[PDB]
Amino acid sequence: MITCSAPGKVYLFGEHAVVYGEPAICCAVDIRTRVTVSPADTITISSSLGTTGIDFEVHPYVSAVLERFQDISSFDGVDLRISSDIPVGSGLGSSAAVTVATIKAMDTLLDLGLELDDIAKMGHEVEQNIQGTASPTDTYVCTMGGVVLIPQRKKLELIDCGILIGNTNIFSSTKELVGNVADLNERFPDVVGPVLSSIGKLSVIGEGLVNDRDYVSVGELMNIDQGLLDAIGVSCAELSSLIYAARESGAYGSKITGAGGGGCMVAISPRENVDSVAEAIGMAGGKVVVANATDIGVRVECQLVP
Template identity: 35%
Template sequence: MVVSSAPGKVYLFGEHAVVYGEPAVPCAIERRARVTVEARDDDRIRVHAEDLSLDGFTVEYSDENDDAPDVDVSESLIQAGIGYIDAAVEQARDAADAPDAGFDITVESDIPLGAGLGSSAAVTTAGIDAGTRELGVELPAEEVAERAYRAELEVQDGEASRADTFCSATGGAVRVEGDDCRSIDAPDLSFVIGFDGGEGDTGELVAGVRALREEYDFAADTVESIGDIVRHGEQALTEATGEQGGASESESLRETIAELGELMNFNHGLLEALGVSSRSLDQMVWAARDAGALGAKLTGAGGGGCIVALDPTEGTETALEYTQGCETAFRARLDTDGVRVEDE
């Protein structure tokens, strides 16, 4: 039996624009999905997912067409529930050259689903890592990332960037532009996350931006401007990392982190213009700013879900807890660990 875990993420900058080749900077956060995999004697897959509904969800199936999953729910719900795990199993079987391997799989996660914190990438990444290890194969994090990207691409009908999966596999702050993925240095950033309890439909939101971009030149310019924000943001991150720990740390580091916040605010404005924010996301963004956050923006696809604010003080978390539209707020540190084995 192997248990692997992988972190969720927030986008400091660049979601949506990354789909069109602009750079993005997601950061892994200390909230994880854990996937336990145990090889079976047959070729069946049994998935138990604790968090898919209040009572969890167990489904057992095999590849044969006449062997439908043994639960009484619609096919689309099953696909929504186990599509990523199914794709992760395929990648693990392929990597280990074991097409008929069967598994008992349990998924547990601290990452809200469909809320912009990359729960799908964390589950897929941890699933591939645990599945391959259970079959005796140890993949480097970069290969887990590449396979998790292919799995997401398949489940999301060709609409996915490498940002979520690379970030979840390697941890820390990363920069993704097309197929160029690298880890970057970042100071110890203090994130506060506000969650409205809802979710957005990533495919629909991406399609909406695509349509706007095709209809209006200024929408295409807006997407490019998000890329410019990311480039400025990267520079500020590099500066902040250099300033951390130096003799004159406090003053210059504070200014550079304030600049990161300002760029996050700008980024949110442009995402709002592209139609992917919502009333509750805007309410949380403004509550965070009013409470003294250095910056706040929606994270991920939008439409509902989470915002991320930069605030080293208690102010934002407390304010969000009393904000209409916010269901829960929590602090999340940058997680420098990516996918890892918890138990073997």
């Protein structure tokens, strides 16, 4: 019985602007997906969704990983179970965490000696196949953990304060939001162009402020980012409500994390304000997950000797 896990993640800065050549800063958080494997003669994949075989409708990311592995090492089958603390449809790197956890669990089952970089790359390839296109960001951060400046792929000082995630419970149509931004940029290139550049710049100045743990300043830049995301059309009233509530209850800052148009926001907060921010996000109608940043990336949690 092998159990491996991988964390979810938030963007401190830079969602929507990476595809335009701009830097970003992401942070792995301690809501994790666990994948447990044990040898069998048959493939079984059990989740909250149910038990299937290789099934690209119900379990696409796992099915892709298992395919990739049989192509480099034969296996009679595997009893594979998935547990996750990352809310479904939440937009916190769900698919990347399960992909990366599964790869590590299969690397372990079959002793293939994959390094982290290899795991991250195979992760990217898997998301690329399922999603049509994908950026290497999610699988890299979920593989490595900690605070990562993207795409330099540089580790930064872990966020030591409180992190709250507020879910609007509105599923974000990502491809649509990405496409609206590209269309808006095409219609108004000399307006939107600088807005996206401005988002990039938050990570240039933000890198240092994260390293000095100046979370007041980090929070202020996060608020600016939220406004810039609002400007390119990826926010909504539900996001805004949760975001302002977090700010009114003592957060350093708050903004969308990820695709926008619903999904989750994030707030960072002094530890003395965590309960008060959580409560305010709930009272504004969001579902709160209290997390902490984690320097722990993909990990073997269990490797039982029979």
